[PDB]
Write a protein that binds this ligand. Sequence first.
Ligand SMILES: *c1ccc([N+](=O)[O-])cc1C(=O)Nc1ccc(C#N)cn1
Ligand SMILES: [K+]
Lengths: 264, 13
Amino acid sequence: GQLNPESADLRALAKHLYDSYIKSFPLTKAKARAILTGKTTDKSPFVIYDMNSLMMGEDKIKEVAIRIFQGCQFRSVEAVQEITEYAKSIPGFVNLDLNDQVTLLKYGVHEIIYTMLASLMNKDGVLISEGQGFMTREFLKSLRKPFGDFMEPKFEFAVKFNALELDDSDLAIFIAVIILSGDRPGLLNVKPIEDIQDNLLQALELQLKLNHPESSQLFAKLLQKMTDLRQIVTEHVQLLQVIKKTETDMSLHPLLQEIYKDLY
Amino acid sequence: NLGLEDIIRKALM
Ligand SMILES: *c1ccc([N+](=O)[O-])cc1C(=O)Nc1ccc(C#N)cn1
Ligand SMILES: [K+]
């Protein structure tokens, strides 16, 4: 490795992406970790860990599963708008065919939402209600089927992903690499997409080498996490298909339905 | 989801 015009350009690209990341996403990983580790004075989230604590936190706030998925997708509109705004800052993205821009984003947003969801998770549970609540992992897992199976694969991804100890500067480039995936179905001009991702991948590799001296093959390990993200998305699409094809009267507490709407 | 594509299209404007 040498400090040459090429490496300096890749550092400028990483800094540009980081600055747009900060402007586009008001809730960063650093802010989420500060809440989870009990270092935010102004924020002491209420902990929901069983049915008793669920009903005690009531004031702090068609199949049931479909309404949850409709509700959380509606609450995820802001995230989609922010991810879309971030993509405009990726050099070359707006010059692509508009159909390809929509295709890259319509598949990419789900993977990025799960990436950001992992920042809200530790081994014990996940932040909800704009950092004002904390829903434990085992309470979610204990809920009746199919609801008890919704979040557990995402916690399993989150613990492996968070063990990489990426920061917001790492995540900014990683998210850009997700968006510029030239293997999405329906893409018209794959080559200009791959040319941009090649630059983002070079910027990502250099960023990880400089920022994580104690990691081995972190570049490869991070890319393998895209395989986990796509598996999570595919499982949801499959579960919705079988839910659309199975008629099951599913009862769930309205407070739990509201909480699931803050998840994904 | 067409609603999602529409959200993305309006945001891209
Ligand atoms: C919304 C709220 C809660 C859950 N959950 O507990 O699993 C899921 C959703 C949701 O709509 N998830 C989701 C994942 C992937 C795609 C796609 N494509 C759409 N929706
Ligand atoms: K812990």
